[PDB]
Design a protein around this ligand. Structure first.
Ligand SMILES: [Zn+2]
Ligand SMILES: [Zn+2]
Ligand SMILES: [Zn+2]
Lengths: 101, 633, 595
DNA sequence: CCCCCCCCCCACCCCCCCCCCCCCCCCCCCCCC
DNA sequence: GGGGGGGGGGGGGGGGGGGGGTTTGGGGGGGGGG
């Protein structure tokens, strides 16, 4: 992300994002006083194509035909929109925690 | 926020002195140490925790003092007026006067003793110039006021809608039905916090439905050292009290015409918990109180409860009189005319056969044919006489039903699995009225009783079979209002013959118009209406509770097989097979043979024998023969 | 002159507690338990003189597994540890911490005493758990009260359902926004002990540390709703239920419908009035925090496999209480064996229909077979819906037949079942899967069940002057789905009726028969015996089908013969099909196909 | 066997928090002994 | 040459202000009657 300060038109850039939409804490300009008042420069900021897909336990593998277990999966970039509902897929990637943002 | 103040006609110093005077003086002297001090020695031994105060004791003490010419300031009125405060006064008096224990306790095993001893040691280390606790923490007992007898407002049982706002603070007594009961949960009397940075624990008492936890160590050990230590709650050291809530509703009869039935929350604490259950009709004494919601929420703090509702020698009183099977069968619904062979079979279903390993021991009977003839009353009477009985109908009992299921409590949001009537009848007997009308799930439920002695669940991820070992009594009243009294029952009844084949016996009975038998029945009915007593002479009708002695006693006289019965019952099956060499579905089968064996075993139980008798087989065959000849019509 | 480690609130020395437990964890002999309890007459040196928990620790080290299961009564047998049982029951968290650390310490002690080549680094890496159990009386769920609130308890109950696995942070990971230095913090009683300033003295910036969520380290937690059983309730009112927390590899140790014991510390916690506030509600939530769970060989198998009467021996064992009917019992025994499978469709199933009168014992045979099989189901066909039997509607849930995937499905009253439901069972018998397509739900739901139908002639009796098709009233090709079809009839005969009555009445006299060995033998056969077909079987298969085809038959009979011959070849652990297997499969079919 | 019914499922005060201001403490520098 | 006192910076505490906290219709599935 990239932001411009509300009281001086300096620009912060390459702000790494947590699971929350994250804004700068200090203004880079020592002549400026600001903490936490920003406008996002859309054209300078960088976005990724993103798509959540939910999976459930495979039909032949459920131990006795009971309710399957479920998991949330995140696709990004060129991997988005390759999967489909009802499709049976193999994934690779990282198991991760996600906080209640 | 400044407050005004007013003078009032009371003094809690004077009344505290009166309360401790009563406590250290009174006994029930009309019945000829003090009652209360002796009871507090029982508390000190940790043998008792429920401290009960009788308002009648307070009244007797007041009358004794007034008789001795000094005014007692009517403590009964004060406790009936502002009851909640006098719990605190009575408990303080007890804490100021309770004697030391007599029985040994292994005193160090209580954490409160160790922690308060350690605090005392630490305080002595300080006190060398180098309260100890909030009293509710140390107070182990629970104190309750018990109302005045008839001889005053606490004595009167109020219906719920008579509980008006002016009663708030008074020790009233309420009457109604409990419509709901909570599961028990603990509530904090005193929270104990450890302090991480000094080890000096600190305490917060809780006196509301909510509280906010402590953070910084307020103790002088930290505060004088200006050491801002952090506090952590300990469930080991915190005093919890048992809490439970129950919703009471006024009786359905008390509701004025058109009004909704009014209801109230009862809160109950300490040892008095789980004294109530749903469907109880009960009188409850308690303090009627507000709670934070100007409109207050309100509840009743329960204090005292009044529910509305040897043998092995005593059975000999009937045994010694003789012919007890015939007489006990004649004692089954004596207001119902005749049909003694049917009653004699219905008794054996309560007594039961043998189960062995499996071998299946329950005994079942179907009544069939024309409606009426006091049959539903007979099934209800069996449900009354028999222990572990339940009455149903093929479409009735339409709440939890005869057939089981997974369920929610949709008035709230939780889910639960609960049994139907066939599980309540487990280890007992189930009576199915309107048996002809039950549906496919009901029919498969009784199938599973007969075929597995269970009822099955296969829903919401739960597969389970619940236990349903039970005798069936059943009533297959026919289609189209009347049976055609020369045909097979399958031309008259809805049910499949497969189900009917599982019953040990079937009695088809027809409501024949026939002047002579009509007059015999009518003479019985009119005599019962005329005389109001002894539905027939020489029947010797035993009362229900007394015969339950013998039914329970007979049920446990399990028999052992005799070679005579082994041969005789093989012969009996072969004899009935000759009749089977064919004009109706009463054929001899292994299941009729098992029915004869179980009926015979129930007769062996009733004659209190170990060796089963060929007489038992022949009489079991006689009931089957009467059953088949009935079915043959 | 020294500090003392004390279990807080108790005056128990932790060092003495540790030694008192260590000296039992080693040097305990299982004979001491037989001195404590009943069955003291059955002390046996070669099973009781071992240093029993060192035997456990050595097997545990070879397997490299973290858990030591510990019956609590064993603590009372050993003299130095009797007090420690009471300390455990009253202060379980601290005593269990001591026992865990002592197990790890003893693993080190054993490898250094033996100066073994096993990795010290592995033992040091490994966490070790004690799982104490059999604490005492399984007091009722309804009976728990405030005195229990820190004690170890043990509850019997029914699992209603469970959560998915829930991540529980055990170590937080903090990275400096200024200098990128990283540090780790163990979570203390659910509180992150956040560093207020950066650790590095050359940076030491305040509030500069931030939590890197996915570099924190997490334990596993799961919550399960455990119900009071409907057996134990005062039956006029509802059963209770209690939440339990279960952790790490104890996650998913049980499932919905499991009746279990759980041993754990009883616990209570406050719950917030509003998550935006510290304010707590006065009455605490309660839960049990579990430390152990429990539900509710080949040498013997080889010895039986050599017997000559083994066909009849296994056949009698399925239902010795019922009349011997041994063609039915032999056919069912082949249904329990099953055939084999080939993935290129066909399945190694076997399917049977018990016809005959309603006045006969076939339902009881079905009941015993439903008990014998590992994963079967029982139901009946009258009024049985095509969707209720199979799968029903948001989510689709499996019905009785699908729940019997991989086991016998017993269905009584089968002759009364509607043609629609039979039309669903067509693709069970043909494909062993259900090809659903409804609003939102499309699926081929696999359900590999060996159906055992029980059926009747239409009306009260079988007509002996008619064939089985004309009697049963179900159409011939439906009967041709099944492998074997049988008549069991109530017809009067004083010889059979005497011997049956004797056979039945003998049950009350007496004080491979048992089902436990039968189901074990069938299971071991399924694990080990997968017969291939020899040419001596091929020749009779082709010939016998061509025979009954010009008796007038179909290849479904031939496929039935193949599956039965493979099932027959699972007897005597034979593992190869030959002529005799085909002959008996064909012969039993000749008893059936006569119609 | 076919069609209709009916059942299900779904759409003003008090606490936490943050910002601002003032005082106190601790270090550095200079002078005095 | 070391220790005290004066002066300036930096941090912590305390106070003050502010914001947040069930009926009606429709389709499809499932079961019952003509
Ligand atoms: Zn700026
Ligand atoms: Zn402290
Ligand atoms: Zn840093």
């Amino acid at each position: 992300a990239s932001f411009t300060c509300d009281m001086c038109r300096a620009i912060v850039d390459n702000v790494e994002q947590s699971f929350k939409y994250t804004e700068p804490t200090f203004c880079p300009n020592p002549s400026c006083e600001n903490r936490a008042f920003w406008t996002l420069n859309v054209t300078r900021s960088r976005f990724l194509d993103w798509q959540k897909v939910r999976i459930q336990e495979n039909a032949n593998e459920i131990p006795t035909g009971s309710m399957p277990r479920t998991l949330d999966v995140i696709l990004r970039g060129d991997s988005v929109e390759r999967a489909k509902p009802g499709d049976r897929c193999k994934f690779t990637g990282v198991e991760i925690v996600v906080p209640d943002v | 926020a400044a407050l005004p103040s007013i003078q009032l006609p009371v003094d809690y110093n004077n009344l505290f002195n009166e309360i401790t005077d009563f406590l250290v003086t009174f006994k029930q002297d009309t019945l000829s140490g003090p009652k209360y001090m002796a009871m507090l020695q029982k508390v000190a031994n940790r043998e008792l925790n429920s401290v009960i105060i009788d308002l009648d004791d307070i009244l007797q003490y007041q009358n004794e003092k007034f008789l001795q010419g000094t005014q007692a300031d009517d403590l009964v009125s004060a406790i009936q007026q502002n009851a909640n405060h006098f719990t605190e006064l009575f408990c303080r008096a007890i804490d100021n006067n309770m004697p030391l224990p007599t029985k040994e306790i292994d005193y160090k095993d209580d954490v409160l003793d160790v922690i308060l001893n350690q605090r005392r040691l630490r305080n002595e280390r300080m006190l060398s110039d180098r309260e100890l606790f909030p009293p509710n923490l140390t107070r182990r007992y629970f104190l309750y006021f018990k109302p005045l007898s008839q001889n005053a407002i606490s004595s009167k049982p109020l219906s719920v809608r008579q509980i008006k706002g002016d009663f708030l603070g008074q020790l009233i007594t309420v009457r109604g039905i409990i419509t709901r009961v909570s599961d028990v949960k603990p509530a904090v009397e005193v929270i104990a916090y450890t302090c991480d940075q000094c080890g000096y624990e600190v305490f917060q008492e809780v006196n509301s439905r909510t509280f906010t936890p402590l953070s910084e160590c307020t103790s002088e050990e930290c505060s004088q050292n200006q050491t801002k230590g952090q506090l952590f709650m300990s469930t080991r050291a915190s005093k919890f009290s048992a809490f439970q809530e129950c919703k009471i509703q006024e009786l359905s009869q008390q509701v004025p015409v058109g009004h909704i039935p009014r209801s109230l929350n009862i809160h109950v604490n300490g040892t008095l918990v789980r004294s109530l259950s749903p469907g109880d009709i009960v009188d409850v004494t308690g303090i009627f109180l507000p709670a934070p919601y100007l409109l207050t929420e309100t509840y009743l703090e329960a204090q005292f409860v009044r529910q509305h509702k040897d043998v092995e020698e005593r059975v000999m009183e009937l045994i010694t009189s003789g012919d007890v099977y015939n007489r006990l069968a004649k004692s089954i619904a004596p207001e119902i005319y005749g049909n003694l062979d049917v009653k004699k079979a219905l008794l054996l279903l309560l007594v039961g056969g043998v189960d062995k390993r499996k071998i299946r021991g329950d005994i079942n009977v179907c009544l069939m044919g024309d409606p009426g003839v006091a049959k539903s009353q007979l099934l209800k009477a069996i449900c009354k006489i028999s222990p572990r009985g339940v009455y149903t109908t093929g479409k009735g009992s339409s709440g939890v039903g005869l057939t089981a299921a997974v369920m929610k409590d949709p008035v709230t949001d939780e889910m639960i699995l609960e049994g139907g009537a066939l599980v309540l009848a487990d280890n007992g007997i189930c009576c199915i009225d309107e048996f002809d009308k039950m549906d496919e799930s009901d029919r498969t439920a009784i199938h599973e009783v007969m075929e597995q002695q269970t009822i099955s669940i296969s829903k919401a991820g739960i597969n389970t079979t619940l236990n349903a070992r039970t005798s069936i009594l059943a009533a297959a009243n026919p289609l189209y209002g009347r049976y055609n009294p020369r045909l097979s029952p399958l031309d008259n009844i809805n049910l499949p013959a497969a189900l009917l084949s599982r019953f040990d016996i079937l009695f088809l009975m027809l409501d024949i118009p026939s002047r002579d038998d009509d007059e015999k029945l009518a003479e019985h009915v009119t005599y019962v209406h005329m005389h109001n007593k002894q539905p027939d002479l020489d029947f010797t009708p035993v009362e229900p509770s007394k015969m339950r002695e013998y039914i329970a006693y007979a049920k446990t006289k399990r028999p052992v097989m005799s070679e005579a019965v082994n041969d005789y019952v093989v012969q009996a099956y072969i004899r009935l097979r000759q009749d089977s060499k064919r004009f109706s579905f009463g054929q001899a089968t292994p299941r009729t043979l098992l029915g004869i064996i179980r009926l015979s075993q129930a007769l062996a139980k009733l004659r209190l024998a170990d060796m089963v008798d060929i007489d038992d087989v022949e009489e079991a065959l006689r009931l089957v023969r009467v059953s088949k000849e009935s079915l043959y019509q | 002159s020294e500090p003392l480690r004390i279990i807080w609130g108790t005056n128990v020395s932790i060092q003495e507690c540790t030694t008192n437990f260590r000296n039992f964890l080693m040097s305990f002999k299982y004979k001491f338990r037989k001195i404590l309890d009943e069955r003291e007459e059955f002390i046996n040196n070669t099973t009781d003189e071992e240093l029993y928990y060192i035997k456990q620790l050595n097997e545990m080290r070879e397997l490299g597994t973290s858990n030591l299961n510990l019956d609590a009564r064993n603590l009372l047998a050993y003299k130095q540890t009797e007090d420690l049982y009471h300390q455990l029951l009253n202060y379980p968290q601290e005593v269990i911490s001591i026992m865990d650390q002592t197990i790890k310490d003893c693993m080190v002690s054993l490898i250094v005493d033996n100066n073994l080549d096993y990795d010290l680094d592995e033992i040091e890496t490994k966490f070790y758990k004690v799982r104490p159990y059999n604490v005492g009386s399984c007091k009722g769920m309804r009976e728990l009260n405030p005195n229990d609130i820190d004690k170890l308890i043990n509850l019997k109950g029914l699992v209603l359902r469970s959560t998915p696995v829930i991540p529980d942070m055990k170590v937080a990971f903090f990275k400096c926004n200024v200098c990128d230095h990283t540090m780790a913090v163990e979570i203390d009683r659910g509180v992150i002990q956040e560093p207020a300033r950066c650790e590095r003295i050359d940076c030491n910036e305040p509030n500069s540390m931030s939590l890197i969520h996915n570099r924190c380290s997490f334990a596993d937690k799961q919550v399960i709703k455990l119900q009071e059983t409907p057996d134990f309730v005062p039956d006029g009112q509802t059963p209770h239920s209690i939440s339990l927390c279960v952790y790490d590899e104890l996650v998913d140790s049980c499932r919905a419908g499991d009746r279990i014991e759980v041993t754990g510390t009883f616990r209570s916690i406050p719950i917030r009035a509003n998550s935006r506030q510290r304010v707590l509600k006065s009455l605490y939530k309660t839960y049990v925090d579990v430390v152990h769970v429990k539900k509710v060989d080949l040498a013997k198998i080889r010895e039986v496999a050599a017997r000559e009467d083994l066909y009849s021996l296994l056949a009698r064992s399925i239902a010795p209480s019922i009349y011997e009917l041994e063609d039915v019992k032999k056919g069912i025994l082949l249904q329990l064996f099953g055939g084999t499978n080939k993935t290129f469709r066909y399945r190694g199933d076997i399917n049977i229909l018990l016809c005959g009168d309603p006045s006969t014992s076939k339902s009881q045979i079905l009941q015993y077979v439903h008990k014998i099989t590992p994963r079967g189901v029982y139901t009946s066909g009258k009024g049985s819906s095509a969707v209720g039997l199979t799968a029903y509607i948001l989510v689709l849930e499996s019905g009785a037949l699908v729940l019997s995937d991989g086991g016998v499905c017993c269905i009584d009253e089968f002759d009364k079942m509607s043609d629609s439901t039979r039309s669903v069972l067509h693709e069970v018998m043909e494909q062993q899967t259900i090809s659903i397509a409804k609003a939102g739900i499309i699926t081929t739901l696999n359900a590999r069940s060996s159906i055992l139908a029980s059926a009747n002639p239409i009306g009260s009796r079988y007509n002996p002057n008619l064939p089985v098709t004309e009697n049963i009233d179900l159409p011939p090709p439906l009967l041709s789905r099944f492998d074997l079809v049988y008549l069991v009839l109530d017809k009067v005969d004083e010889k059979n009726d005497r011997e049956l009555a004797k056979h039945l009445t003998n049950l009350y006299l007496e004080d491979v028969l048992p089902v436990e060995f039968l189901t074990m033998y069938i299971s071991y056969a399924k694990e080990h015996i997968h017969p291939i077909i020899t040419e001596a079987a091929k020749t009779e298969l082709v010939r016998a089908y061509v025979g009954m085809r010009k008796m007038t038959a179909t290849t479904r009979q031939l496929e039935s013969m193949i599956r039965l011959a493979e099932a027959h070849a699972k007897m005597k652990l034979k593992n190869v099909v030959e002529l005799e297997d085909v002959q008996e499969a064909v012969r039993l079919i000749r008893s059936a196909i006569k119609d």
